[PDB]
Symmetry: C6
Subunit: 288 residues, 6 copies
């Protein structure tokens, strides 16, 4: 039992979405058949629906997706059960590991992932919107990874990081940030998955002021809000002081955490050779 | 007799509006046949009309809906009578429960709803634009809920909250806020319903300064304006000092309030499998 | 002899303009046959012409209506005579009743209207852009009301208020405000009607500074400029100190005013049931 | 011999431009046959050409009119001679009568016009962008008046005022103002006409600071720049201290000026009754 | 031997570009056959190519011209030789005569032009973006003049001024200014011409601060950068202190300069009479 | 063995991309057959794919390229080996030579290139976004040069400079800068090439503050980050103090560096003569 990296699976899915008319849909996919989940997300004014491993199709409704459905949700029939989450008494929902100038956001994610993997849980980690990682970390990349994990036999998913999503919703210039964090927790509950998100507002002017106000938001919207107060590396080993919030505890708690340093094109080429290249027409490409 | 939650009914209606050409209309609906009401709202420059349980259709007039009709209204023939509102001497119109840093906006809404339900009134509550709630809380979601309650046997409707509507009209950067609050009260009178709205400008920079100026606006535009001055939780029990305005009293009144803590996908999947996906054409999707 | 309320007549006209292609025009109307007046207004870059009770049609000229015609005017053939205005020696033109923090804008309008009605004049009052009033108060709603009164046997028209028109032209962030106030006075003279407009820049940051600069503008552009300096309610009775300007008096005059408190869907449903719904095509809906 | 008012002639020409496809052109006009002049102006990215009394046609070039031709010019073949300007030794070119808080811009224009009319010159005056005047005063209205006077037997033209043109080019928030003032002087020379323009930046925040910088600009770009320093009315009579610049005098001169107070729909209706109403198509209406 | 003025030749070329579909091209031109040069410039996202006297055609590539080609260049086959530039040892490249509050930009240009004309060089001068001059001075007007001189027997070209080009690239609110100045020098070298440009940031808020930073930019990008430090007129005669930079001299040098005051529609009418007027279609007119 | 300049090869490729419909693609190219690499980049919402010497084709996906793929990557099958990089123990990846007010960015690039060329490596240098250089330096020009070097027998590529790319992503007004620097390093690793980038934020207001924050970013995202602290020229010879970062060294190191001063249209004309000119249609030209 080891941690599965969804990054390449998300990358190759983005390669397939770039080569076809999404209104017609991308059929004969193999995203996962373990759970019968349907992810519905907003891409600007368009809706992009991920059918449970069958298909991914886009719709352009007469009215904006922002008014109609907001951010995005997950629907499942008949049901979704994560037997191992019950076994290990791990509640479904979203967690936010947030750090400022102290850093150690990625280190702690790797620590908690390997720890969860050791306990017998099926752990998945997606790398995005950070240095040395190929995924740009867009809202589409988060929902693609979320769906890929949801429909598959994944119990705990680690999304590192939401840096691009935060910037995309103009978090560096917030209602939109709240709606996103609520939707991500709502999603994790509906899919009955434990999703652990990470964020460092390093693109923001006042990094630490953004950390406290985002942590206060995360505390209300998400199941767990974890703030890295301090972080120090000692060769292989690390140690970090953490502030943790669990809804609905009106009391916050300090939580020390230490351990060892745990470390983590065929589709497009095929298109280029065959002219199958205007599949948008009069509608401008949408972006969330 | 218990409180009915309109949230899922609004959610499934949004699912049907996202899957069809609204110019043609969404027919064979079952919104309600108790009252013969027609809701007419603005979505950008478009008009979205809710026929009384028959149908929901959109029009794209030659001139903007903003100039033509402004926000939105309700028309009814022949008449609308809420016998229980006369019985319990409850005047039709809109109420605004507004709070700042003190909070307790949701708690008081739940308190007043259960209290109204106990008196024998048909109470409906719609959850939106807040943490742990699926509805994003758009203007469309407010008018959808308003119509669903209007055409049904609902005497008192609780809309918690207008946080997204407030942000949508740029209340965080107001004439547009005034027009909305007036239209909502005008609607509640035309439909002969008691609609109780809630707001907390928590996305605003100066929260308490926004509370006083919105409360002053609400006092003129709506039947009742309720400002939560203070709020404290004592285990199960709560207590709050409230400032209340009733038009046209040139005198405001303090009003103490205490009690116990009262607590509150098939359509889209069917579309994804069948290519029925450009139903907008040359006109850009509208948003209010 | 009593005051006629044009509000519902304007509302039902807006209902007819929302349901048809205005390029083709709205025929078989009954706006009024007393005077042969034609109202020509600008809606963005489009021109909306009101024929004298026959018809209302829109044109989309090759060049902007803003360059071509500016705001709006009235043309009449052969002539327009208001016999009662001569009888009571009331000059045709526009008047602006403006107030700040003192208020009493609506009270004085009701006072002057009932007073004019008592003298034997045919008085019409249109309610817009204010609390408890259905009309949103757009530029289209002002010109609709102006034309409806113009073609009918109306001698004095009271437009309360221009709050939305002021905001529409960005008066809260002015050349556009000047052009509007001049056009409204020019209109009232061309139609040979006494139109009394009201304004309170309550949406403006510095309300009283806006009052003095708008009153100075009104003094030059309009026949009468009335500034409510003070206002106090004494049960039924009211009293207000007023500053009045008449062009071209280089001297202003104080004017005390006291008295008693005087108080003031079938078309759309028919459309919804019959698919007659894209009547704009490639041209975006215009807004002034 | 009296002063001719071009205002109504400009108004009725705007009525004809609003009712036809300008790409096809407005033929069988009678603007004037005295001189063989062609006015070429910019309306956004479009070019609107006035043939010498024959015709007015619009072109939509592949590239913007702003890059291609800038503001506007006049071309004439074979030649244009104003015999009376030689007789009375009046140089062709543009003059700018500018005033601030002192006012008396209109009074002096009326004084100089009647004075020029007395000397035997053919004087024309166009009223625009000011109170009690129907013309909105757009760039199109200036060039329409300029052409109508140019092709006719007019020696001196008074354009009161350029207030709207100044606001249109964003003079109240300048290169665009310079280009306009240079083009207007260049035009008057090419047409061999004496055009006297007037301006009061009363819509500007700091009125007097705008007066000095616009007067400094006018001094370089135009033949004569006249700044009204002071102005006072004494019943019928007036007196004003004036600063005058003539290029290329490196010395300015004071110039006292006193005297008496000198004072100054069928086409559209025909269209409304006959559906001749989309004549723009895919190109958005242009505005300068 | 005298100085040739390209202004009218540029003006009549702009008249031909405004009357045809540039995608088809403007054929049978007589721009010059002395040198086989092709000017390629950017007009927004479009590319406007000037073939060497044959033709001027525009292309609308799938991707923006800004990404593809940046500003503009010149290509020549087989070769371009200016025998007189070798004779008089004048290096090919661009020169920038820049002045602030001191002025004398035009005077020095006229002085250096007549001086170059006296030495036996073929001198051309184009007048633009300044008072008493018909050309508006756009980027298109600069490249039109550059090409007309390039293909003709011109050794030294004087472009007075780049005031409009500077404003066009938002120099008054810079990377875009740098790219333009580099492209103009690159052009002059490729065409083997001596082009002398002039600029006065008189539309800028802080004129002299803009002079020093533009002179520092010009020093790196162009062959010669000439800053007019002081300037004084003494009747006919003038004198000016100048700072001069030649790349790559670390050291700047002062350079005194004195002397005498040297002083400097058929196509469109033909179109108006013949309907040949939509030649753009769905693509919006481009502007640089 | 000498340094190859890719500038003209990039220039002639841009000439071919400007003359055809990129949706159809540009076939029969000879970019390089040494390595089987495919470059995939984003141009606004469009994707521009460079097949390994065969072809360059553009796609316009239903959803934005920014959400789908972010910046750009390289895919290669079966494999890419740079035997000389192993021989000389030079790791594949991106390097950033950054300087502020000290300069000497170009001098050091020329020094390191000639040094690498002496060691036996195949060195390529592309000149862009700087004075005396024809390439404007856009994102397209960087990826064009990157691909041309990648598919060819190039071991070390010097891109001088990223000044335009930095401005293009709004670095002078950052998440977008981070994503670009990460993608460029990711690219260099995937292609197994040593790419050395250069930057001087000379268009930025505070040049040196931008240098420290970009160097801190480069330190995390790229293999090597080189900051020029000081630089002085002594005739032929130069000397510079440098701060160098190698990931993942938590210690920075000073590094002195001295040496001698080392110094560095047919396709378009063919198009102009033959009308092959609307190849975009309804989709607006994209720009990154």
């Amino acid at each position: 039992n080891s941690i599965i990296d969804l990054g390449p699976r998300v990358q190759s899915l983005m390669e397939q979405l770039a080569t076809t008319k999404l209104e017609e849909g991308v059929k004969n996919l193999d995203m996962g058949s373990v759970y019968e989940i349907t992810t519905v997300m907003v891409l600007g004014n368009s809706i992009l629906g991920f059918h449970k491993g069958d298909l991914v199709k886009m719709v352009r409704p007469s009215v904006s997706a922002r008014d109609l459905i907001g951010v995005g949700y997950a629907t499942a029939s008949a049901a979704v059960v994560r037997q191992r989450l019950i076994e290990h008494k791990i509640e479904a929902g979203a967690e936010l590991i947030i750090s400022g100038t102290a850093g150690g956001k990625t280190v702690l994610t790797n620590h908690y992932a390997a720890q969860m993997c050791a306990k017998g849980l099926k752990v998945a980690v997606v790398s995005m919107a950070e240095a040395e990682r190929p995924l740009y970390g867009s809202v589409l990349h988060v929902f693609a990874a979320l769906h890929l994990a949801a429909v598959s036999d994944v119990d705990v998913l680690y999304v590192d990081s939401l840096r691009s999503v935060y910037n995309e919703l103009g978090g560096n210039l917030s209602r939109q940030v709240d709606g996103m964090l609520t939707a991500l927790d709502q999603y994790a509950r509906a899919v009955n998955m434990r999703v652990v998100f990470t964020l460092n507002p390093s693109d923001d002017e006042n990094v630490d002021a953004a950390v406290r106000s985002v942590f206060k938001t995360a505390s209300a919207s998400m199941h767990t809000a974890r703030r890295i107060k301090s972080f120090a590396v000692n060769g292989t080993a690390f140690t970090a002081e953490t502030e943790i919030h669990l809804r609905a505890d009106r009391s916050n708690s300090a939580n020390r955490v230490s351990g060892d340093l745990v470390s983590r094109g065929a589709v497009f080429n095929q298109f280029l050779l065959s002219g199958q290249s205007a599949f948008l027409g009069p509608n401008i490409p949408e972006s969330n």
